[PDB]
Design a protein around this nucleic acid. Structure first.
Ligand SMILES: [Mg+2]
Ligand SMILES: [Mg+2]
Ligand SMILES: [Zn+2]
Ligand SMILES: [Zn+2]
Ligand SMILES: [Zn+2]
Ligand SMILES: [Zn+2]
Lengths: 162, 162
DNA sequence: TTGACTCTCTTAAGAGAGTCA
DNA sequence: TTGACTCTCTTAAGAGAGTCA
């Protein structure tokens, strides 16, 4: 809600609840042929999810609190960043999963960045494979690799140059 | 259904027409601090675009030919790939700009791959910066770099470990 | 047969808000 | 007040199809 104290209280209540979510160990590629371990705090698959939480989509949740007798509601991963600018360079800031695990609500696995930066981590080589993200990746992106291109650039005639 | 010969004739007429689009020389990052040059064949900003071409969206076009009294229409960048499989690993194939220049219709700047592979090229370090795409990038992706993350992973209490 | 417009849809990373009990 | 559902929207890489003369 409006006050800084109220916002800090929301963040603190969210942290306490998410901190009681099951902790699931995930072994992940780091790049460079190395492996690491992440501890994700995973929201349950079905209700009940935890105090203040409700599912608005297959992998979307919201956090809700009643403050000045009115309901305030946020996307469930946005709560750690309520005191941060909500835009950057005119682009909306989004909660971005460094662990590439939507159910995870561990704030140590989240950052706050443009949707383009967010998406791009899917292809990052990872913290031991050449990640250049200033806020470093925790793992190699799940889509990193050679791809599966069906056909490359080609022409039948002689009209084009690269 | 169109025969192989008919499809080849469509590809040939498309190439003939695109080969008359204005050819624009662009200097581009290749990765590794090297610069290179790409020659894009750019569809005009407004009508007329060229024989067979029409705009269906701000940066979307279609190619249309009438064969034996039947109107056939294709996405304007899909025509080079009409003799290729239209799916791979259960995913639809998409025309993918290696030059990242949507108006360009140079078939030497296009490949045919899943939408995920297509998107991921936006963040690739480039052919001289570590590209691992099996069908190699022509340039560093426009969104490659450290990013502009507003806030990194953080907690107020001690409920979490990474 | 052709040009120049019109409309909505797909995907996978993300969102806001309303209806009930 | 809190929980458990419902709906549609945003973005930027991509699509299909209709109307009229
Ligand atoms: Mg993400
Ligand atoms: Mg592309
Ligand atoms: Zn996690
Ligand atoms: Zn990274
Ligand atoms: Zn081009
Ligand atoms: Zn590449």
């Amino acid at each position: 809600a409006l006050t800084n104290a109220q916002i800090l209280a929301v963040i603190d209540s969210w942290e306490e609840t998410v901190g009681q979510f099951p902790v699931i160990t995930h072994h992940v590629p780091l790049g460079g042929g190395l492996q690491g371990t992440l501890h994700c705090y995973e929201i349950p698959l079905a209700a009940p999810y935890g105090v203040g939480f409700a599912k608005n989509g297959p992998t979307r949740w919201q956090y809700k609190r009643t403050i000045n007798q009115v309901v305030h509601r946020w996307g469930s991963h946005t709560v750690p960043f309520l005191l941060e600018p909500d835009n950057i360079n005119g682009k909306t800031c989004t909660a971005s999963h460094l662990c590439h695990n939507t159910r995870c609500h561990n704030p140590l696995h989240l950052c706050w960045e443009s949707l383009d930066d967010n998406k791009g981590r899917n292809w990052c080589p990872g913290p031991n494979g050449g990640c250049v993200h200033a806020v470093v990746c925790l793992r190699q992106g799940p889509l990193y690799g050679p791809g599966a291109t069906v056909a490359g650039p080609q022409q039948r005639g002689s009209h084009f140059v690269v």
